[PDB]
């Protein structure tokens, strides 16, 4: 009841919503420790500051929206915009000692499609908390806490942990159904009070620590409708950074489909050099100001301003696009990413 068993043997394993290994082995993993699913957690005694970069191995993010160790980061994405591919790139590229994944509320098919993106070397440092759509709501809700608790266990060993929860949206729908079942009323958008109060309690467990850390990425699944998602809204107000993927970029075959102007890192200025910050700011402005040259040629115009800002954007388009667009096998170290950024704004 509300305790799970943990240990190093969790690494490389598929684990259910309450922490039980799901692969059938004749020899069971050794999991000698019990931990509560809930933590007080790390009392502000004392609370830390985010001041070191957390490298994802994604040029657009590392370059223009740099993450920090112990940050809480949201990725907001609808269907068919390459979310799972981006999550895969992050797991394979991130500077994390241990990855704890919570895969909540999707069908087995989607789980296997994600797992296929992770090579043996990545899986070997992963704990995979998986609760598919068919599982009871209680199990899908608990998966978020199980994952968080396991991340804390590994943090406590001095590991820099990446907690990746796909998705807080489906966690919340599970927690909704549990809450309503207990007799809570709908307060906003079909959600009872319990789900809202759980969000900061979960997110506040990520963060830097004396030894080790937990940097957390939470996905928010966007519906192709105009219905308010109050869970996503509350998350927006808590996060330290947010990455937004758009259908508009996905349909241009622009991947990762990150809209830079809608994305932000509240910690970047604290974890990158002033020169890095300056180059990123120019790159962002160049991205925002760019306009298809076709549009001027078709009206016979010899523009070229003299409009300095717009002229550089066209001149630097291919460089900028090759920088922010990045294939799965298009690998880039943090050193290389920064060197490449300076090149695209030159
Ligand atoms: Ca909203």
| Omega before residue 38 within 30° of 0, cis | no
Residues near 101 by Cβ (< 8 Å), separated by ≥ 6? 91, 126, 127, 128, 129, 130, 147, 164, 165, 166
Residue 188: DSSP 8-state: B
Q: Which residues pair with 73 in a beta bridge?
A: 217, 241
| Ligand 1 centroid to residue 189 C-alpha, Å | 10
Could you tell me the distance, in angstroms and rounded to a whole number, from the CA of residue 243 to the centre of ligand 1?
16
CA atoms of 192 and 187, how far apart (whole Å): 5
Neighbouring CB atoms inside 10 A of 261's CB total 11
Q: Which two tokens stand for residue 155?
A: 């943090």
The structure was resolved experimentally with X-ray
Pair 83, 75: CB distance under 8 Å: yes
Q: In this structure, what token pair is assigned to residue 82?
A: 């390459």
Ligand 1 (ion): residues with CB under 5 Å are 228, 233
Burial class (CB in 10 A: 0-12, 13-18, 19+), 13: middle
- Ordered alpha helix ranges (H), the chain: 59-64, 83-93, 108-115, 120-123, 137-155, 168-181, 193-203, 230-238, 247-250, 268-271, 274-289, 294-297, 308-315, 317-324, 334-344
Q: 273-346 has which fold? A: Substrate Binding Domain Of Dnak; Chain:A; Domain 2 (1.20.1270)
Q: Which residues contact 330 (CB under 8 A, 6 or more apart)?
A: none
Q: Where are the domains of the chain?
A: 1-272, 273-346
Tokens of 283: 């790159």
For residue 83, the CA-to-ligand 1 centroid distance in Å is: 20
Coil, helix or strand for 77?
strand
- Tokens 């998350």 label which residue? 235
Cα–Cα distance measured from residue 177 to residue 190, given in angstroms and rounded to the nearest whole number: 9
Strand 207-208 relative to strand 213-221, pairing: antiparallel
Cα-to-centroid distance, 288 and ligand 1 (Å) = 24
d(CA 61, CA 263): 9
Question: The domain at 1-272 falls in which architecture?
Answer: 3-Layer(aba) Sandwich (3.40)
Cβ neighbours for 85, distance < 8 A, ≥ 6 positions apart: 117, 255, 256, 328
Between CA 79 and CA 277 the distance in angstroms is 32
Dist. CA 201 → ligand 1 center (Å): 21
b/e 267-284 (16+ beta carbons within 10 angstroms → b) = bbeebbeeebeebbebbb
| CB-based contacts of 158, cutoff 8 Å, min separation 6 | 211, 212
Sequence-ordered list of residues with C-beta below 8 angstroms from that of 225, at least 6 positions apart, any chain: none
Strand partners, 166: 103
The values of phi and psi at residue 160, to 5°, are -85, 110
Cα–ligand 1 centroid distance for 343 (angstroms)? 38
Q: Helix, strand, or coil here: 35?
A: strand
What are the tokens at 193?
A: 């009070």
Cα separation of 111 and 132, whole Å?
A: 8
């Amino acid at each position: 009841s509300h305790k799970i068993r943990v240990g190093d043997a969790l690494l490389g394993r598929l684990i259910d919503g309450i922490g039980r290994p799901m692969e059938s082995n004749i020899v069971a993993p050794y999991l000698p420790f019990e931990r509560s699913l809930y933590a007080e957690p790390p009392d502000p005694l004392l609370r830390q500051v985010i001041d070191q970069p957390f490298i994802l191995g994604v040029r657009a993010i590392d370059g223009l929206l740099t993450c920090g160790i112990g940050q809480r980061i949201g990725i907001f994405a609808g269907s068919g915009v390459g979310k799972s591919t981006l999550l895969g790139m992050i797991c394979n590229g991130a500077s994390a000692d241990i990855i704890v994944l919570a895969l909540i509320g999707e069908r087995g098919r989607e789980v296997n499609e994600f797992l296929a993106l992770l090579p043996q070397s990545t899986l070997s440092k992963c704990v995979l908390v998986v609760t598919t759509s068919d599982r009871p709501a209680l199990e899908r809700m608990k998966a978020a806490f199980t994952a968080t608790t396991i991340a804390e266990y590994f943090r406590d060993q001095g590991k820099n942990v990446l907690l990746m929860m796909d998705s807080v949206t489906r966690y919340a729908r599970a927690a909704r159904d549990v809450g309503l079942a207990s007799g809570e009323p709908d307060v906003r958008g079909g959600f009872p009070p319990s789900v809202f109060s759980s969000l900061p309690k979960l997110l506040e467990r990520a963060g830097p620590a004396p030894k080790g850390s937990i940097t957390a990425i939470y996905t928010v699944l966007l519906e192709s409708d105009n219905v308010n998602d109050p869970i996503g809204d509350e998350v927006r107000s808590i996060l330290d950074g947010h990455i937004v993927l758009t259908r508009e970029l996905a349909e241009e075959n622009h991947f990762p489909a990150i809209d830079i102007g809608l994305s932000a890192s509240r910690v970047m200025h604290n974890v990158v050099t002033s020169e890095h910050l300056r180059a990123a700011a120019e790159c962002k402005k160049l991205i925002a100001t760019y306009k298809n040259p076709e549009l001027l040629i078709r009206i016979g115009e010899y523009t070229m301003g003299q409009d300095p800002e717009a002229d550089k954007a066209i001149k630097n388009r291919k460089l900028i696009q090759n920088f922010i667009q990045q294939s799965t096998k298009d690998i880039s170290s943090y050193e290389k990413t920064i060197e490449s950024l300076f090149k695209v704004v030159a």
